[PDB]
Paper text:
An imbalance of the MMP enzymatic activity/endogenous inhibitor ratio leads to irregular bone remodeling and tissue destruction. In recent papers, we have shown that the use of bisphosphonic-based bone-seeking MMP inhibitors (BMMPIs) makes the specific targeting of individual MMPs in the bone microenvironment a feasible strategy. Among BMMPIs, ML 115 was the most potent and specific and also showed antiosteoclastic activity.
ML 115 binds the catalytic zinc ion of MMP-8 in a monodentate fashion with one phosphonate moiety. One oxygen of the first phosphonate moiety is also hydrogen-bonded with the catalytic Glu198 side chain. The sulfonamide moiety is hydrogen-bonded with the backbone NH of Leu160 and the backbone NH and CO of Ala161 belonging to the antiparallel β-strand of MMP–8. Extended hydrophobic interactions with the S1’ loop account for high MMPI activity. The comparison of the two ligands’ geometries explains the reduced activity of BMMPIs with respect to monophosphonates: in fact, while the first phosphonate forms the same monodentate bond with the zinc ion, the second phosphonic group of ML 115 overlaps with the isopropyl side chain of the monophosphonic ligand by substituting a hydrophobic group, which positively interacts with the Ile159 (MMP-8 numbering) side chain in the S1 site, with an ionic group.
Residue numbers in the entry: 80 to 242
Write the structure that this text describes.
Amino acid sequence: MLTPGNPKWERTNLTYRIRNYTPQLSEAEVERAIKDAFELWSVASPLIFTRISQGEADINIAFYQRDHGDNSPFDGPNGILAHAFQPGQGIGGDAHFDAEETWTNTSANYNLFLVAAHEFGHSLGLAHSSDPGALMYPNYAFRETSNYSLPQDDIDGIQAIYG
Ligand SMILES: O=P(O)(O)C(NS(=O)(=O)c1ccc(-c2ccccc2)cc1)P(=O)(O)O
Ligand SMILES: [Ca+2]
Ligand SMILES: [Ca+2]
Ligand SMILES: [Zn+2]
Ligand SMILES: [Zn+2]
C-alpha cells in the first residue's frame, strides 16, 4: 500500500519504452540508467520489466521541457526534476524527466538513475516516505550508485503492494 487509493498493476510483467533521449548522456548511458532503475524494484518484488523499442508500452519514459501535454509543466533548470503517474492505463505509469536538467551518471546533480528509480516507485504505486534514508523520500540526494540496492523502507513498500 501507500499511494492513496492503492493503485497497482494487475500484471507483474510490465513493458517500458524510452521515447527520446538527453544530450547530456549517450543513448547507452540513458538505457543503462533506466534499466538499472527498474531492476532495483524487480529484485525486491515479482515485477519483471521488458523493454520495447517502439509502439505501446505500459511505462513510457521521456525527456520534455516546460509544457508537454499533461498539465504538469516542467520549470527549467533545477527545481522539479521529473514526475510519474500512478499505475493505470494510458498515461498511467509513465515517467517524464525535465529535459533542461544536467543529467549525469556521476555524483554531480542530477543522477538520472537515482531520479528514475524514485519516479518508478510512483509508477508502481508508492507515495513519499518520511524515512530520510528511503529512495522514496521527497527530496533528491546523491548516494553511491555502483552497487546500489533499495533501502529497506522501499522494499517494505513494494512488498506491501506486490509481495
Ligand atoms: O514536483 P513533483 O511533485 O512532480 C516531484 N518531482 S521532483 O522532481 O520534485 C523529485 C524527483 C525525484 C526526487 C528524488 C528523491 C530521492 C532520491 C532521488 C530523487 C525528489 C524530487 P515527485 O515526482 O517526487 O512527486
Ligand atoms: Ca526543472
Ligand atoms: Ca502508461
Ligand atoms: Zn509530464
Ligand atoms: Zn516523488
